[PDB]
Amino acid sequence: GFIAGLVPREKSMSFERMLFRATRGNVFLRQAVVDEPVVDPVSGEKMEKNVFVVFYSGERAKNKILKICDAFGANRYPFNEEFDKQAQAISEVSGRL
């Protein structure tokens, strides 16, 4: 499964603490640097939140991961299978913004 999303750098400890057994040691989240506060999807004020993509195994575990990502509130966008498509989408989104 795919657990693409975002995990805040400030809330990194909370994300790691929550659903620890769900990760099972075979899922690693590639958190973004988030040195500059990432603009919130609903708030222009932005927050120091990173983007992390994990691996999803098990239906309930994937649902819990999605719920935790939603509760995190970090800047999350769908992750394309090809990195080129994701980069093009990022460029288009930046231009639109």
Partner: protein, 311 residues
């Protein structure tokens, strides 16, 4: 009963320092811990769906364990004779509770499906659903017995407000006037004594009224006939029989249900431990954990031993 006191120890990192050390010569066992247990592997390696189902139904298993514990405690308390069971008397997995944890013979195809852990979770849920029927039957039997026992023998012992026909004197009526001359043959004394009788006769209603309730002592109410008193005594015998049934035979049934619930809780805990091991080790079924009931310092020693694999 006893709460869940099994540390989630994967096969690679067992309760003690070494995986084999958990079975014998444990660092926890150095503190005299009785921790010793094994898990029967499933037929095939459970899928990630099985782990997801276990994670989702952790709360359900907690609710089932709470229901089982509450039902067993209430059954022991109410009948007042179901508490006689012990660890060996319960015979979970055909062994005392300490040996029950070390015995995984109940993880066969009999109660669990013995299929991949996905089917094992469904089997455990079915066992819990069946166990709920035991609590329902216990509640029904308790209600029936309480209705029986309180129905009869709840009145008085005669010559009083209720059930005074048992002390009846069998022209005269059930009065038992507790704190008379006329043309009627008042020269008589009824045997309505458990109370006392007064000179009265049915030839004159005035004499009976004066001797029963006209003034002074008041007439005590009684069951209409002595046959009503006999029926009350028979119903009291039947109610005592029903209460004795609920307190001895239904208490033994409750003790058997408590043993079955303990076995089911042990099986569910073993399934949860297998899921935790699969999370913290290889997916195929493999566990080396142990279950016991040590003191708080014993739990601290267990944590010190198993700090290598901590949640």
């Amino acid at each position: 009963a006893s709460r869940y006191w099994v540390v989630s120890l994967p096969v690679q990192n067992s309760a003690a320092s070494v995986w084999n050390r958990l079975q014998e010569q444990i660092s926890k066992h150095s503190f005299d811990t009785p921790l010793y247990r094994f898990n029967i592997p499933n037929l095939r390696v459970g899928t990630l769906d099985s782990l997801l189902a276990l994670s989702d139904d952790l709360v359900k298993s907690n609710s089932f364990v709470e229901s089982v514990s509450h039902k067993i405690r209430r059954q022991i308390e109410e009948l007042e004779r179901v508490s006689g069971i012990e660890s060996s008397s319960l015979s979970v997995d055909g062994v005392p509770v300490d040996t029950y944890l070390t015995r995984f013979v109940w993880d066969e195809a009999k109660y669990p499906t013995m299929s991949p852990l996905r089917e094992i979770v469904d089997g455990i849920h079915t066992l819990v659903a069946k166990i709920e029927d035991d609590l329902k039957v216990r509640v029904a039997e308790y209600n029936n017995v309480r209705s029986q026992l309180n129905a009869i023998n709840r009145k008085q012992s005669g010559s009083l407000a209720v059930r005074d026909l048992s002390n009846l004197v069998k022209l005269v009526t059930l009065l038992a006037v507790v704190p008379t001359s006329y043309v009627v043959p008042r020269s008589s004394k009824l045997l309505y004594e458990d109370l006392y009788t007064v000179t009265l006769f049915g030839r004159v209603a005035d004499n009976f009224r004066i001797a029963a309730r006209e003034k002074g002592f008041q007439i005590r109410d009684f069951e209409y006939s002595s046959e009503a008193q006999e029926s009350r005594n028979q119903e009291l015998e039947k109610l005592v029989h029903d209460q004795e049934s609920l307190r001895s035979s239904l208490l033994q049934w409750c003790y058997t249900s408590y043993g079955e619930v303990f076995s089911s809780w042990m099986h569910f805990c073993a399934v949860r431990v297998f899921a935790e091991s699969i999370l913290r080790y290889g997916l195929p079924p493999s566990f080396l954990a142990c279950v016991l009931a040590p003191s708080v310092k014993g739990e601290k020693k267990v944590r010190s031993i198993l700090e290598e694999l901590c949640g």
